[PDB]
From a paper:
Pif1 is a DNA helicase belonging to family SF1B of Superfamily 1 (SF1), which unwinds dsDNA with 5′ to 3′ directionality. Pif1 is involved in DNA repair and is necessary for the maintenance of mitochondrial and nuclear genomes integrity, in the regulation of telomerase activity and in the replication fork progression. We were able to crystallize the helicase core of Pif1 from the thermophilic bacteria Deferribacter desulfuricans and Sulfurihydrogenibium sp., which are moderate thermophilic bacteria, living at an average temperature of 65 °C. Pif1 from these bacteria are named DdPif1 and SsPif1, respectively. The helicase core of Pif1 from thermophilic bacteria is very similar to other bacterial Pif1 structures already solved. The HC contains the features of previously described SF1B helicases: two RecA-like domains 1A and 2A containing insertions 1B and 2B, respectively.
DdPif1 apo crystallized in spacegroup C2221 with one molecule in the asymmetric unit and DdPif1 in the complex with the nucleotide analogue AMPPNP crystallized in spacegroup P21212 with two molecules in the asymmetric unit. Though solving this structure was not particularly difficult because of strong homology with the template structure BsPif1, used as a search model for MR, the DdPif1-AMPPNP structure has a possible domain swapping between the two molecules of the asymmetric unit. Indeed, the C-terminal half of the two Pif1 molecules, containing domains 2A and 2B, can be exchanged in a region where the electron density is ambiguous. However, we choose to consider the two molecules folded as compact structures with no swapped domains, since domain swapping of RecA domains in helicases was never reported before. Only one molecule of DdPif1 in the asymmetric unit is complexed with AMPPNP. The nucleotide has a good electron density which was also checked with the calculation of a simulated annealing omit map. The main difference is the folding of the N-terminal part of DdPif1 (residues 1-20). This N-terminal part is not visible in the DdPif1 structure and may be disordered. However, when AMPPNP is bound, the N-terminal part is visible and contributes to nucleotide binding. The adenine base is stacked by an aromatic residue of motif IV (Y183, Y186 or F187 in DdPif1, SsPif1, and BsPif1, respectively) and a hydrophobic site chain of a residue of the N-terminal tail (A4, V5 or M4 in DdPif1, SsPif1, and BsPif1, respectively).
Author numbering: 2 to 423
The structure:
Amino acid sequence: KLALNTEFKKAIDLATNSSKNLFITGKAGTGKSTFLKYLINELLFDAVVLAPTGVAAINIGGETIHSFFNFPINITPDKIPDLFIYDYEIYKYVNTIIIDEISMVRADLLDCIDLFLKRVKNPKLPFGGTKMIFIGDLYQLPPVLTNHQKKAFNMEYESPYFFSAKVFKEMDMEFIEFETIYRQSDKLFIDILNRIRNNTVTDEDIKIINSRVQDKIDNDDGYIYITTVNKKAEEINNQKLDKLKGKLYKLNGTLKGNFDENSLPTPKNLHLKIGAQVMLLNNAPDRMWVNGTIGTITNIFPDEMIIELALENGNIVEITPFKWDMIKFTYDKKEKKMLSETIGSYTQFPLKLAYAITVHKSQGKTFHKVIIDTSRHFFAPGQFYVALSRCTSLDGIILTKKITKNSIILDKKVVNFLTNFQ
Ligand SMILES: Nc1ncnc2c1ncn2[C@@H]1O[C@H](COP(=O)(O)OP(=O)(O)NP(=O)(O)O)[C@@H](O)[C@H]1O
């Protein structure tokens, strides 16, 4: 039911017929998710799909990288050879292994997959000779810190980011980018995002971005506070909910089978009040709401199990609990095949308090009106770009504090690596 872009048909050809080592990239919202959705279902295809984190795998209907390869948490590329492989026969059946949100996987973690695949498969070809499709826009790099949040492995890695994987320097994968925009296609905003990606920001860009700074906000309704501090975001949602009048409703999620309670999209104990600012987590088929749409609860119906909210201006919708599937790829020793099957179900309203969110937890979502916490002196490499990528237009963006071109410093380091990808 979707249009096939000229770069969409180029990517499905190189992946479904001339399948060899492809890399889908682009900007935030350019079609990479629907391209992967169109490959697995609504098309004749079979392949494993992996994601770095458990919550990422639940959204795309895949399974964790560590879960698929039975990797321990402490796995390093040096522990791969001294790692006893059971169920060795099953790995010779998997081809075209697709990884999603590739920018989020570590450098060492990606080389573990190569060395693991080289064991169960041809030991000379990269990744054991399996077709590697990587998706997830390239400039959504995870945040790093110098004193905090390190493991500092410096054996041969220039950086913990994905591109520093040694498998790349001995591989050819003919990268393909998705450059077509949508969804509040603010061109001036898009071009500023392009120059931040290119690290070619002009002084007029900084003047335009700083024009969105506001120390005061009248009618903050509809705005979501995007910060980096996981602590601060939780305080804002809870404080905003206490200041709301009305009965507190406690809705409980049904956890069937074997599901990871540490990867729940929305809390099992959902505390909501009529009037709360909530966020939809379901990306509806009829395009009424996307994953990240902000609404306001207008009524709660516990008996009928229906939560009513006006989606913005007046787009009133009725929401029922949604079911998430826990996908696990298993080798059927009887039918000799791999096709994926659910091991657990989590059912709960696709809703979450949306007064504030963190950059890490807002992955994949785009909002309409954001309040970005730019009180930090510096932004970790590529962390300002990901904050702006969570919004759809410059008119929706509000900055708490004015930034300078020195704030986007340490982007210079990574951009010289990302340009090497040719
Ligand atoms: N080729 C296309 N033709 C028509 N509509 C499209 C196309 N690609 C994307 N869209 C629309 O734009 C939305 C964004 O694409 P989507 O595949 O969801 O990427 P995303 O998850 O929003 N973020 P990203 O993976 O960075 O692109 C989709 O939900 C569609 O509504």
